[PDB]
Paper text:
CspLOX2 crystallized in space group P212121 with one homodimer in the asymmetric unit. As revealed by sequence alignments of CspLOX2 with other LOX12, the N-terminal C2-like domain, which is a common feature of eukaryotic LOX, is absent in CspLOX2. A well-defined boot-shaped channel connects the surface of the protein with its active site. This channel is lined by hydrophobic amino acids and is most likely involved in the positioning of the fatty acid substrate. The catalytic non-heme iron, deeply buried in the CspLOX2 active site, is coordinated by three invariant histidines (His257, His262, His449), Asn453 and the carboxy group of the C-terminal Ile569. The sixth ligand of the octahedrally coordinated iron, which is positioned towards the putative substrate-binding channel, is a water (Fe2+-H2O) or hydroxide molecule (Fe3+-OH) acting as a catalytic base for hydrogen abstraction during catalysis. Besides Leu304, we could identify further crucial residues in the direct environment of the narrow active site that form a clamp-like structure, including Leu258, Ile296, Ala300, Leu502 and Leu506. We also found a putative channel in CspLOX2 at the same position that might serve as oxygen channel as well. This putative channel connects the surface of the protein with the base of the substrate-binding channel at the opposite site of the iron, which is in line with the antarafacial oxidation of the substrate and a high dioxygen concentration at the pro-R face of C-11. Despite extensive efforts, we could not obtain crystals of a CspLOX2 substrate complex.
Lipoxygenases (LOX) are key enzymes in the initial step of lipid-mediator biosynthesis. They catalyze a regio- and stereo specific dioxygenation of polyunsaturated fatty acids to yield fatty acid hydroperoxides, which can be further metabolized to a variety of signaling molecules with diverse biological functions. CspLOX2 is the LOX with the highest relative amount of bis-allylic product reported so far, hence it is a suitable candidate to study the molecular basis of the dioxygen positioning at the bis-allylic position. We demonstrate the importance of an active site clamp around the pentadiene system, which fixes the pentadiene during the reaction resulting in 11-HPODE formation.
Numbering used by the authors:
A (entry chain A): 1 to 569
B (entry chain B): 1 to 202, 207 to 569
The structure:
Amino acid sequence: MVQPSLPQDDTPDQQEQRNRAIAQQREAYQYSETAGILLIKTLPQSEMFSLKYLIERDKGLVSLIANTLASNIENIFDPFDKLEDFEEMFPLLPKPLVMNTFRNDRVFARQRIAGPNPMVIERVVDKLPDNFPVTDAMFQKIMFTKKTLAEAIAQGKLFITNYKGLAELSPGRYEYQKNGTLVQKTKTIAAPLVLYAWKPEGFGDYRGSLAPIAIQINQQPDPITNPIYTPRDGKHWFIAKIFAQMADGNCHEAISHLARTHLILEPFVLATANELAPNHPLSVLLKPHFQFTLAINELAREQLISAGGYADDLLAGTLEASIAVIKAAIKEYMDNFTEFALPRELARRGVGIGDVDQRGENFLPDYPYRDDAMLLWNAIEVYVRDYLSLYYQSPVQIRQDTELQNWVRRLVSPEGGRVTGLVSNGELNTIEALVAIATQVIFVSGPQHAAVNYPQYDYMAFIPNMPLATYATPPNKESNISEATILNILPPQKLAARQLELMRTLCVFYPNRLGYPDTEFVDVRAQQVLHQFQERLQEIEQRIVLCNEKRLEPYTYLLPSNVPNSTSI
Amino acid sequence: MVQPSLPQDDTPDQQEQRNRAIAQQREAYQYSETAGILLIKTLPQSEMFSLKYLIERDKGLVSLIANTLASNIENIFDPFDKLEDFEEMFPLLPKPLVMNTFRNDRVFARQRIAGPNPMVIERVVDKLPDNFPVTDAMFQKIMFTKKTLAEAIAQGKLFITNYKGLAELSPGRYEYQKNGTLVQKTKTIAAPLVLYAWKPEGRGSLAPIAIQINQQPDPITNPIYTPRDGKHWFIAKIFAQMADGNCHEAISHLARTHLILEPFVLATANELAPNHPLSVLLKPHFQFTLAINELAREQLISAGGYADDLLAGTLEASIAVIKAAIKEYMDNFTEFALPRELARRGVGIGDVDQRGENFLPDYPYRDDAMLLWNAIEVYVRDYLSLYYQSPVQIRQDTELQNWVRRLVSPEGGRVTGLVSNGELNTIEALVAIATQVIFVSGPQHAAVNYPQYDYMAFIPNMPLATYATPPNKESNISEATILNILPPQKLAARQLELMRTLCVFYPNRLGYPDTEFVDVRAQQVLHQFQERLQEIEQRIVLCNEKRLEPYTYLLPSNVPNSTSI
Ligand SMILES: [Fe+3]
Ligand SMILES: [Fe+3]
């Protein structure tokens, strides 16, 4: 166990040892790709899941065998017979928290700020999209108000989710035998726009909340084939929400979860191995936050984004279409890396802590993801800054650290991740820039992945709340809607089962815990910095527990006790 | 990648490097115990399953989710409604090979010699046990012969399986909620005696003659059943199969492959340098062995695990059987070498009649295992000769001498049958030890592990517990009677779950290690072993065209390099 040091501070003997270790690491951590996604060529045994991990994962899979044994769902591509059958899918599993209230408009809307994908909603500035022709009359009928849209917008009261990033998907296909013949079917794609309003009054008892106003299921308006639905539209409104939720779930899995936690971490894990000695302070800082990350990304390669895997079976598009969405989300992230730092990302959507009205109040006061993620972001930043200050007291030490400079060059290179938004001026020159990079990597690996991964079961294991594909077209607005209509839009039995299977496996345990690495730092000064980070997380836990006593609903996913140390499941 | 060498031949500097490695290995491979069974304290990450292993094991578990989705079995402690329902448990899985023919007496008997547990049957010498009062009249009625029992025994025609090792099990209990009421029930244990005869006519094969379901005879409450007893005979075979299945899992499989290997794996780490030739030889045959034994600890022999759920006895009773089986093996280690084990049961290749033909001519486990035993023996002799030429190099190898001391010690495995004269002194003795270890880890484990699905995933052929008492020999047997003896739905499902996971894939392959030997001479000896395995594969393929049913489990292409599943 070596005291960490910068390579230029070491003797020539010690530097030879560092280069030896790096050369060996480069041989063990080679770069590869699947479908243009950067991944590892072969996983080192040191990077495999632990025994303890495997025991927990297996308990999960065996719990699914038991639940399936106790369930009445069948291995068929028929719809369920009754909508109530979706409630019977959990005889031996926890009931998903959304299950009993998912029909409520407020429960729908609050998933934008506290559900699995709190990453889409943005404040409307200036005007709605021209292809989303909501009228004053619609707004006024739904809000029971004489205020106009322009007035609401001028007050910062309107919010939108625009799923146009899904507009080019080729719809996925599926097929099966029924009575000795092959039936071939296609999923139905949608790319909705959803308008929300902040309602300060709430419902008399004055916890304010977001409320949904209008849904246009596809991007190009048409009064007949693509009208705007509102809550006045009865069962047609319920169906419009289903399509919007399906769209949110596709954006969730491809963009917010797979692309922008799991797969954008892969180049950082590999660059750390390919350029940093084992006793490099940055490697020692970052490796606890990479535990099991290569391995879980290899399972995603094998089981999630493979032909016949979960993405192929469950999502709206063809596998090829889903992979294209994933790769475009990676590219935009890497190209703009520092603009995806949490405060900047939120501010770009108009929903950051600085987005306030004339009285200093946030235009979106009820946003548990933002509130709790900012606590964790700020605590990690203090932890990282205090840690790196033990090793870099002056910027020349950044510039003369040949390993660190190689780590940056690897990341920005085309073959190393193409992280062209990583640094300014073509080179890492300051300590504060490195603090921001390492803060963002640790934030993504622990907190961000916890926020998008662990709500999956509560909101997406109950299939009707967020089905990963829709299986019939939106009915015409004047058509009558039966239970059969809804059951034909929702997934068939075998695919509903498959989606529960996925969601349970992704949420069943916590592989590790934020701030609690498997081995202590050798440097007692760094162990003290870590102990203070652990104290701060305890303070943050109690603050969130207090906030949750007053929130409309508790938001538990960013409690530090529930945040892993690494992206690992 | 350093040339292997004996420690006494190394420099002082090399010797201190060897000793540092051994000290680190002792720290990473510490000894521990669960319920008196020797295991590792903490599994080193280097000893974990590989990614590729995990991917295959996960395919197997997901296949069970899919199969269960497509099945109609329920999560209940009720019996199945019809016996035919046991045949509908495999909508998306391979059909177990025994399923169609399991009622046939010949198919029942041939599981003694080609089934999951080919380790029990033995030739009757002198007389039957006194607590098994088979009479001439019974024998003559079953065999439709005038030969007496004593004449048949004198000709070496009779064979027996005696499950007396189960006679003291406390019966397992189970409970469930049924209408806000907690129901508690007990399994029924049995310790049968089964008489077999070799019947030359056909073609020639073993035939079952008589079953007594428990050890103490009584003409009314524990009678001798024969093939003349109709459905009662069918039920007696169920109890005999259940007993074979319990002896299989506790003794032949868990004890005498998985758990007796654990001390050898730990001794190798605790006493041999990484470049010790014996460590280099053995470690390919230990791949994933510590890890699979840790899953056995956690999932198989834990409270609420598979053994607790499925086996006839309480968990404490099954663990006692396991531990007794380990101790007899270790106390008599060299006597469990394949040729000597077969000979002690009267069924070895030397057990021949006046005309030179075996008393038990049809014995695929024996014939194919002997081929692999002999090939491994040549491999380890030719390999070890590269490094030991005279016994003084055996005696002056301090690491090897420590390896033996560790194994025979009370805290390293207590392998008191390992060595003669208190000490390992010859190359041939070490050849015998390493041959047996490699044989157990590959071939023996293959022969007891991979038939589990074909013979035990079809629950009526070999249920791991019985759930009602043997009916009175005079009662009418209904379909419901049999369904109450066989496992309830939930426990049948749990037995299929287990047997599928134990058989889904081959983690590695006999003779094909992950890394080449650095020593080119050792590479050549390994290549010769691979060639011999190819010859054996073709010889077994030829035998399988003349056997009544193929025995595929010891084809070298189906034998792993290590006990790993
Ligand atoms: Fe994840
Ligand atoms: Fe096994």
